[PDB]
Design a protein around this ligand. Structure first.
Ligand SMILES: O=C(O)[C@H]1O[C@@H](Oc2cc3ccccc3oc2=O)[C@H](O)[C@@H](O)[C@@H]1O
Ligand SMILES: O=C(O)[C@H]1O[C@@H](Oc2cc3ccccc3oc2=O)[C@H](O)[C@@H](O)[C@@H]1O
Lengths: 620, 622
């Protein structure tokens, strides 16, 4: 289950396959399999990584439904492949892919936001190799994220009772209809690379955990002793693995040799004296170096980690034993040109903006992000709530075992990929599913989600808190949200209801806060906000003005400040982002406190000033 | 002098070093050299490739003056470096760099827009290697592009006679003051990679030229015969040259003797050759294979060089591609985007080429510096013509007497042409943008004496011997004696914008007076800039300056005038898209003369131009 990011070292090399590929669109339900046997005819250029949808203005690829086919050639020296295990990794292909090498089907993947790989040792040959990747963008009632099989996209307008409308629907061009509020960007959204490991025996997975901290400093910068655990998995076939712990300056501060036992695994614990802890706003990273022993080294892998604990205790959220307060937002992987394509310039800039704002956290709304963003947040001291793509869900999905299977894959896959990041403090198993109502519906939702809550706990060796992000609903008939480790609520009082009336919005919010006060869980906002067009101004700000967005946060935040059990404020959204078109989306979702080009609206300045005065620890 | 882009094949591998590096700002005139000896203290993250300026909103890196230091570590298997020649290539470090590996100074480079490399065979070691790169952003009276040592940035406002202003200037924080109208984005703007070649003997350079075409078809798609030439240089006997067509079929091949300094050269006849044309690209591959003594079947080294078969000839007032009279449709561009700055972005390059097609344009100029190599490969495959330009922008008489500037200028011309010579999409070289050329006394002759040797140098350096131009600023064309001697006259004119403002009747009258002057000169003439700053969303029934309507009306009126001149062979407007500049009173969040917004969205004028260009053929318009 290990999916360690490809590394280059004395025992391993990575050969990136990013660049400008060849590309063709294909059919709604098929593509020509023979395209894997020869160069694509009349190809278009297509940069990888990137969504394909915004990379060709002659076409309207945002309207594309079904398959596209990518292809490129590559060659590597015979010297490099000799005796090695050769692996082809796709960091993400959104949503499903069939992969061919030299005309041989390697296999397929379903799930648009997690990495997958193939052993191509036997399919590779000398000279030029032809790599063909068919990618399917289709979403529907059995996918995560969820699409609608008929009707409209989420938040779409209709006149369904007009006979002409009903008839035209029957014959309209097939389109994906997201049951979620972000554009269905598709393609090779993240990197592609060929990499090598030793063949006879190799490191397959590494898990590092913080088991216990002894005598944590008052400022939490250090602990007198930290007990960490390692678990290393091997593939291949009295062997041993050397584990070296490097501090921030690369000094080997601890080292052990562990026996490998057969399924082939080595595990143990290491005590670190005067351990330097990882904290929001004050990152510190160690490296665990694993070396498979025969002076020689057979294989090696360098795994970054941070030493810190996470504990929900009553209505507090303790990081290294200190009461943490979330400041931040949901984000999206979204930008002009790239779409959902990973862009590390943008990631570096965004992390700097999180600091400029004096925020300390975000959520990976609504899918796991590119691996590089978590590495960045590890080094920059920004906390993450890591979320699977289970958005758009309701009772139709809970009754479908295929969806449950995909959901379990997404949870296991996210945690297997991301478990070693100190920046991740909580897992989210869904966003805005249907949880409330009458009859059997609330119990049916609980019966669907409770085993997934348990799965996220079982899968994470650090046993971090697990939540489910709840959409505005009848909280009195929802019986699932209140059972989560942290209550995470999306609320739009004064925007989607009581519209523009901030007094009424705050009154309604306080009524629901009184409800949560009794439940006795820690609670935080994971969404709240107001669409805002930069440059629209009013002396008495109305909806869509910069002033209304600022006033909205000023009023709502004054209310949650009065509740000691309310442990965080993550707003919606960090930045404006693309959506399916519709009458409430002014060139996408405009609830960003920043524009899509990362420029600050009035509310961003107001929030920066507020957040400057709120400490990471001890606010409540 | 060869700088072939790194390739992976059976004898060569490339190891990319892009990613998130460590980064620190340093001083105005220095940086700590000891930072090369250990990991940078308290580093910031910085993505490579990219400009650094817009990658950290906590800092104000747009205001930074002087040095920054990049650093990262890397490791590669010993088995792959063993016995190989190891080269570290920087596609671009803007503007100057000192490079260290494991604490050893490899060397330095000046020139922010062309690649450079170091042999690191001896400096590499097993395990982790520490690569430290100091990058200097400073510009001034001896750099290309040119900065101002004092005063204001180009087209900056001043009240120089106010004593308080004069005094405050003396004590103001040092800042780069561009003498050019684009922001001074700096850093590791393009890719970094380590690559290998065989050590004993290897291919160092390849030049492919189209020497002659016989009996070109009426539609220019083919010629009965094409004579091409190859010139292969080696470092560190025979080389096999194979010519592969679009399907990879070997249609021609010769084995050539290597003579010492070590080179092989010759000619190859291609019967029924498929030609490269604007709007109808066709590419061959020349595969060069170094053969062992002497001799066996095995290959010592190989390189695959893309090329296209086409001729370029200025004839009277026509610009002939494959003997057909071409008409340029397009624009100056910039490598410019949110977040990336001047950083190369192939998603953006792929998108921009699709927009060039959407507009029905056929060409652009690399204003005002050589672009990333990948964009030329893309234009080769997409049939888009390029005017390739060096960063000699902001120049005036202060520079012409400066030997360091002249050397840097010669370096840029030789470096650009050495890097870019094999692209069929490149049809013309530009040796400068908007230098001072006119005036009285000795000034016009001084400018001519500076630029004429550079014109000759561009001709001597290009084995294809393509036309050479100098892109001319709006000036007194009657006292300029340099522009009229270029192979194609390329003019930047802003009648109705920077002069006769808003009066399109007067602008067209003035343009026609200057066109009458060029009609007498008897050379082919094209626009390389003309336009109007335009804020998307500003509208008027009678469009005034900055409205979308005025921009549309501007092109409608000016283009109607040049359509009347048979010797006017192209229209490249300013600009493809809005881009960042130094701040000032005439730049509304940068330069807004884009027909597209900075996010590549079309203004009214873009739609009008799309319809116009749809009706103008690549060949035979005039
Ligand atoms: O609407 C948004 O901006 C975000 O909506 C979230 O889901 C919710 C939608 C509504 C709609 C009407 C009334 C209350 C709601 O409460 C919600 O939580 C969704 O999580 C985001 O992805 C959307 O972008
Ligand atoms: O001004 C621009 O938008 C571009 O100007 C070009 O150079 C010239 C500037 C001026 C200024 C005042 C009057 C006439 C001018 O004519 C010019 O040719 C320059 O090449 C571009 O880089 C600028 O962005």
């Amino acid at each position: 289950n290990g999916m360690l990011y490809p590394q280059s070292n004395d025992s391993r090399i990575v050969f990136p396959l990013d660049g400008v590929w060849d590309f063709r669109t294909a059919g709604e339900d098929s593509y020509p399999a023979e395209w894997a046997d020869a160069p694509l005819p009349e190809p278009l250029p297509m940069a990888v990584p990137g969504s394909y949808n915004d990379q060709n203005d002659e076409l309207n690829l945002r309207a594309h439904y079904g398959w596209v086919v990518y292809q490129r050639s590559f060659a590597v020296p015979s010297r490099l492949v000799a005796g090695q295990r050769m692996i082809l990794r796709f960091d993400a292909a959104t949503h499903a892919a069939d992969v061919y090498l030299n005309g041989q089907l390697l296999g397929s993947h379903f799930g648009g936001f997690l990495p997958f790989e193939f052993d191509v040792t036997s399919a590779l040959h000398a000279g030029e190799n032809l790599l063909t990747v068919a990618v399917d963008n289709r979403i529907g009632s059995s996918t995560l994220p969820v699409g609608n099989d008929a009707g409209t996209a989420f938040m779409g307008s209709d006149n369904a009772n007009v006979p002409a409308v009903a008839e035209a629907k029957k014959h309209a061009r097939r389109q994906n209809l997201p049951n979620f509020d972000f554009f269905n960007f598709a393609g090779l959204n993240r990197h592609v690379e060929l990499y090598t490991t030793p063949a006879d025996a190799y490191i397959a997975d590494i898990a590092i955990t913080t088991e216990r901290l002894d005598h944590i400093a008052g400022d939490a910068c250090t602990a007198a002793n930290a007990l960490i655990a390692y678990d290393v998995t091997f593939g291949g076939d009295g062997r041993q693995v050397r584990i070296s712990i490097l501090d921030g300056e690369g000094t080997v501060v601890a080292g052990v040799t562990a026996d490998i036992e057969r399924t082939a695994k080595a595990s143990g614990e290491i005590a670190i004296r005067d351990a330097k802890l990882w904290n929001p706003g004050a990152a510190y990273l160690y490296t665990a170096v694993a070396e498979l022993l025969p002076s020689r080294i057979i294989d090696a892998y360098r795994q970054t980690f941070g030493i810190r604990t996470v504990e929900v205790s009553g209505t507090t959220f303790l990081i290294n034993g200190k009461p943490f307060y979330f400041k931040g937002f949901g984000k999206h992987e979204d930008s002009y040109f790239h779409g959902r394509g990973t862009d590390d310039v943008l990631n570096v800039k965004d992390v700097s903006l999180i600091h400029w704002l004096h925020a300390n956290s975000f959520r990976t709304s609504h899918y796991p992000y590119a691996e590089s963003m978590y590495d960045l947040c590890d080094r920059e001291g920004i906390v993450i709530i890591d979320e699977v793509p289970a958005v758009g869900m309701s009772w139709l999905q809970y009754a479908n075992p295929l969806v449950a299977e995909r959901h379990r894959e997404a949870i296991r896959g996210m945690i297997a990929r991301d478990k070693n990041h100190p920046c991740i403090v909580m897992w989210s198993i869904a966003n805005a599913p249907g949880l409330d109502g009458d009859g059997e519906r609330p119990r049916q939702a609980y019966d669907y989600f409770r085993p997934l809550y348990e799965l996220a706990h079982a899968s994470d060796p650090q046993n971090r808190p697990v939540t489910l992000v709840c959409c505005q609903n009848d909280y009195t008939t929802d019986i699932t949200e209140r059972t989560m480790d942290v209550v995470c609520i999306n609320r739009y009082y004064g925007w989607y209801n009581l519209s523009g009336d901030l007094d009424a919005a705050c009154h309604a919010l306080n009524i629901e806060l009184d409800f949560w006060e009794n439940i006795g869980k820690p609670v935080m906002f994971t969404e709240y906000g107001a669409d805002t067009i930069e440059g629209i101004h009013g002396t008495h700000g109305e909806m869509f003005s910069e002033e209304f967005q600022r006033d909205y946060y000023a009023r709502i935040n004054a209310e949650i400040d009065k509740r000691p059990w309310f442990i965080g404020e993550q707003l919606w959204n960090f930045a404006d982002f693309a959506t399916f078109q519709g009458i409430i989306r002014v060139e996408g979702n405009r609830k960003g406190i920043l524009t899509r080009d990362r420029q600050p609206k009035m509310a961003a300045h107001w929030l920066r000033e507020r957040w400057a005065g709120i400490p990471d620890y001890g606010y409540k």
